[PDB]
From a paper:
D-Galactose-6-phosphate isomerase from Lactobacillus rhamnosus (LacAB; EC 5.3.1.26), which is encoded by the tagatose-6-phosphate pathway gene cluster (lacABCD), catalyzes the isomerization of D-galactose-6-phosphate to D-tagatose-6-phosphate during lactose catabolism and is used to produce rare sugars as low-calorie natural sweeteners. The crystal structures of LacAB and its complex with D-tagatose-6-phosphate revealed that LacAB is a homotetramer of LacA and LacB subunits, with a structure similar to that of ribose-5-phosphate isomerase (Rpi).
Similar studies have examined the efficiency and substrate specificity of LacAB for the production of rare sugars such as D-psicose and D-ribulose from D-allose and D-ribose, respectively. The structures of the LacAB complex with D-allose and D-ribose revealed that the substrates are converted to D-psicose and D-ribulose, respectively, which bind in the same orientation as Tag6P in the active site pocket. However, these substitutions were revealed higher B-factors for ligand after refinement. The interactions between LacAB and the bound sugars are shown schematically in Figure 5C and F. The O1, O3, and O4 hydroxyl groups as well as the O2 carbonyl group of the substrates interact with the same LacAB residues as seen in the LacAB-Tag6P complex. In the LacAB-psicose complex, the O6 hydroxyl group is 2.7 Å from the guanidinium group of Arg-134 (LacA).
Numbering used by the authors:
A (entry chain A), B (entry chain C), C (entry chain C), D (entry chain A): 1 to 142
E (entry chain D), F (entry chain B), G (entry chain B), H (entry chain D): 1 to 172
Write the structure that this text describes.
Amino acid sequence: MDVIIGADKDGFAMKEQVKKYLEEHQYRVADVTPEPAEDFVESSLAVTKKLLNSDAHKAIMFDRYGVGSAMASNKVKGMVTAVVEEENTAHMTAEHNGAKAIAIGTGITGYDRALVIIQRYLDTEYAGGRHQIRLDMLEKMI
Amino acid sequence: MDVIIGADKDGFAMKEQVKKYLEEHQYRVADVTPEPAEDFVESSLAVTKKLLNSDAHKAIMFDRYGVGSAMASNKVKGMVTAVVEEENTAHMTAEHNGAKAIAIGTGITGYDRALVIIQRYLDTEYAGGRHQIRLDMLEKMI
Amino acid sequence: MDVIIGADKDGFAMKEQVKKYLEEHQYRVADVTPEPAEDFVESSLAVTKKLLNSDAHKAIMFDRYGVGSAMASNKVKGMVTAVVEEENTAHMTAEHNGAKAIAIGTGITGYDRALVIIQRYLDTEYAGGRHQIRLDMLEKMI
Amino acid sequence: MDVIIGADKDGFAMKEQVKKYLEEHQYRVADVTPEPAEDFVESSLAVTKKLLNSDAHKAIMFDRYGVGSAMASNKVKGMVTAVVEEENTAHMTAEHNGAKAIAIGTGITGYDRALVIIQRYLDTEYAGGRHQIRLDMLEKMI
Amino acid sequence: MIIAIGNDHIVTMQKIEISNMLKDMGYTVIDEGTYDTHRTHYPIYGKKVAEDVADGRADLGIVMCGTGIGISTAADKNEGIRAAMCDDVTSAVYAREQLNANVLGIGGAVVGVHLIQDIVKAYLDATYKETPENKKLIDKIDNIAKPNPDQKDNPHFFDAELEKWAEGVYHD
Amino acid sequence: MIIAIGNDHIVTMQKIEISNMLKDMGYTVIDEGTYDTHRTHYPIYGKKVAEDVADGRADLGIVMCGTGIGISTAADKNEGIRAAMCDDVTSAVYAREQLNANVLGIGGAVVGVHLIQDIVKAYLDATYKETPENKKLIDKIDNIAKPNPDQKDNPHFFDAELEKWAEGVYHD
Amino acid sequence: MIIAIGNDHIVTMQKIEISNMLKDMGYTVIDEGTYDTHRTHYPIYGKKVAEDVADGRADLGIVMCGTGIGISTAADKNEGIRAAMCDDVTSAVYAREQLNANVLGIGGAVVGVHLIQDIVKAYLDATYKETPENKKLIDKIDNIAKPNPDQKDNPHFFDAELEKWAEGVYHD
Amino acid sequence: MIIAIGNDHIVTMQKIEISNMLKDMGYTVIDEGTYDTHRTHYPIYGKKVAEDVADGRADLGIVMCGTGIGISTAADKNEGIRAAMCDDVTSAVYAREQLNANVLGIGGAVVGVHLIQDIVKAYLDATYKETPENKKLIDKIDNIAKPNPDQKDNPHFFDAELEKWAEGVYHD
Ligand SMILES: O=C(CO)[C@H](O)[C@H](O)[C@H](O)CO
Ligand SMILES: O=C(CO)[C@H](O)[C@H](O)[C@H](O)CO
Ligand SMILES: O=C(CO)[C@H](O)[C@H](O)[C@H](O)CO
Ligand SMILES: O=C(CO)[C@H](O)[C@H](O)[C@H](O)CO
């Protein structure tokens, strides 16, 4: 499975740890920010571009609060980014939403919890069906 | 106001950060683990001992998951330790419970959130009144 | 205390029974339909007229289903008529609403229940206070 | 469809009206109280005996409040009697419960409403299935 | 068909149950009554539902409050409306069949939800059966009140009372 | 005074409201009915409440289910019990005053909470008043059923049915 | 101040609690989200709340769904909006103080009511404090999306999807 | 497996949701926590659940109150118990796998029901994985408190405090 990752200065440290984790678990990782991005807008948009152009359908954005990377990337047409800070949304956003990416706030979520959130997100497939109407609506928006 | 703090190897890093934060904000801190404790049982019990044997009513225990320090320190007769991961319990446990100490898991809670949790806890006083019956009950237990 | 009563052909029988009941319990009754009214529109309007043009604040309208007498009399500006089939509304409509009259359907409510409903209604005074805003609103309508 | 009916002095009048109604609608009626029963215990038990011995599975007991006929007849092993004063229970008790009979209180329920209750009860079949466990439990009791 | 529904704060939960049922049944619903459970005033929602029905935005209306008396009375006090206060299936069917009532009132705090569902379904399923007898009754009913142009379709009709409320004029 | 209360899963919320009220009124409550809303069987709780009353562990009992018919009937089918199914205040008062009913049954899904509160209050406030007439009725009722020692104080009485249920015998 | 609020059917009860609180706090509320718990679609309400805020009918907006992700994303995808998805107090305060977020999103099924209340209170109490740093971030965010006049103030924007739904195209 | 559950009056509704889920999952449930929403005291139910687990009447326990701190602390203060206060899946799994916690505490007013369900399921699904490391930690934990025979299996343990409560000693 492919996973796109990116981060600004505040999320870089965790991004590096997660990258190691992903490689250890046989994931093909595409890091769009080998060096920390100027800010979360740059990193989140870099992740969005790489994702929407790649065949990957999973991505992780790292910054201080998560909120920013999601706020910025969701402005992109067709993109769906979920800020995740607990274990239920970790899988529900994948199951119900397009969850093309999740955003983790390094100042909000501890590492051990982030890994559980990440693994649940990666292990969950989109359910489609009735949920597609909402995704069609979102992709229609700017 | 006085604040008693302590941590094992996992929570030591954040403990050091919070100590600097607290001292910068005019708080008189009593660090019972200048060097990381063997484990969370030793650190939580050290904090509890110093607390119950002092005129301070606020304490912070640091470890990896929070649960351990609370599970251990709550075994001490008269002690009341709250694991805190969000901002509502941060103040409610002090208002309603004896909240002699809060336990923060560094693998669960990010630093920025930890500071908000800590500040809310420190800024809240016990309400007494009807709540005392429950505290009287707890102190009666082992 | 005074009570205004009236009924059409369907509610006449119970009306006569209640009149005897009321008179036996020291109630001063004003019967506006000594002979059954043509229909519930005539009986309910007769009761309403006598009520709004008198110093009484309690009235009982009798017909087959209750709904008709209330539907008709409520069209009169300032009137408030409650169809009553159970014992809670019996007192609540007087306490909260102007409850200038209650309407009982003889094809719906048995006599023994009717008496309990009536007694509860007669024994309850309007609470005023916050409820007045709603009564002021109703009286403002046609 | 067969229907067993019975009543004491207070329920006799309505019983007679309903009997006429049932005959007009092609129902085969078995009246166990051509003359009013001494009390509701006698009438309700008379109805119960005739029912549990007949092939009929519908019955109507009439008294002043309904409560008594149900309280007495339900003491009979295997009997299930429902006091009915509104239109939902009228059918739900047949659908879910054994509803071998319904009890109507003439001092509680008006004639027009009683007819709607009766017709809904007569038009509804027991659903069986999951409900049978509860009926098996009831029939096991004294 | 379009059903307009309204309620005061005491029965918002019961209103939600009925709204859900109506939609499952295929009805289009216009929810006017209050949306939360914050203290408000029944006449406001009774009037809104009444006007939806009178103006043709909705075919029928359903209104509820604790006992239903308040809001159903408010709905009745509007042009083109015949509101039927019914806590039972029997009178509700009579209301529709004989009086062609176009607004149903129910006490959400005195009637259980299963029975409320039954009353609503019976009321909706019923059909007005005109006769020279009930047509005369209905016409008499439609001509009792005197039309007030200041009330008809006037959203600021109760502003006066609302201001006094904000000023604490109606304290307990 | 001690009041035992029970219910099936359809009306647990209504039971909770009544429990709260009874305690605020100063009564001691023994909650037997089901505690959550997981599908279960009304006779189980009707029997539990009935025995609390018959054995003297409770002074009176109150049982509820969707319509009340099932649980009140279950309660009535026990030694020492006179269970009255009352969805109204009038018959509830009659039940207490004339039949000395010691178990009150109510349909939590057909009666609104405010009216349920009124029925319970009226029933409890009422007092049995013996008369040569009702004493005779009560005696008749108390002697209709034939006591079954196998049912009396046997909490495992329905085990056979519960097993058949766990085995899918009662599928829809 | 005016607060617009919206939600999908999964969290209508949580929305009601927040609505009640906002009014008790003195805010004027414009409830757009769904009013009952009948299955519906979060983008509809997210868009309605977003436009209330963008058009100046409301000062701020609050949207909720099970996790908040869907409705907060829908809200964010509108001109003039900066929607922040915050299940905690810390990031909510950051959203207001640093990003001048004008729409708050919360997961009504993952956050408990008491914490939801705290998040809302903290968000509202917070004040945006401009700095050369966040002014630059905010400008970037406001210029990412390309405006679509066909979406702006068009309440029929999702009609095609709603029709496909009514026709069973989105079956499970 | 048997799960004992308890709660104070603030989260009775959340407890019901979990009880329902546990039963759907095949677990046998012993509900000890309060049954209605009348003001009561968390230590009572925390102790009852703790003893069920310690005495072998239940395999594991789950306790909840507003924040969960009170009742989980009460559960921890009993012989044979290791109570884990967890508002998240991660620490709950650690609690079971490393500390073999036999009682799970959750804040029913701060965690949303969907997340509570996830925490409970993860906690139950997890298995204790003994190592010389955690066995030493656990043994140290089990030996911190000094056993008090007057508390162990003593139902009247809190009578003293309850009497004072009835006497208005704990007024606000
Ligand atoms: O039943 C009502 C009006 O008839 C209302 O629900 C109550 O008056 C309530 O207190 C709101 O005014
Ligand atoms: O009313 C009831 C029994 O008379 C019950 O609430 C229903 O049958 C319910 O479906 C449970 O069996
Ligand atoms: O959380 C949600 C969207 O992110 C919604 O509440 C759920 O998808 C729900 O099933 C309605 O679509
Ligand atoms: O969270 C709690 C104890 O920690 C309780 O829910 C509250 O104190 C509540 O007020 C009952 O005491």
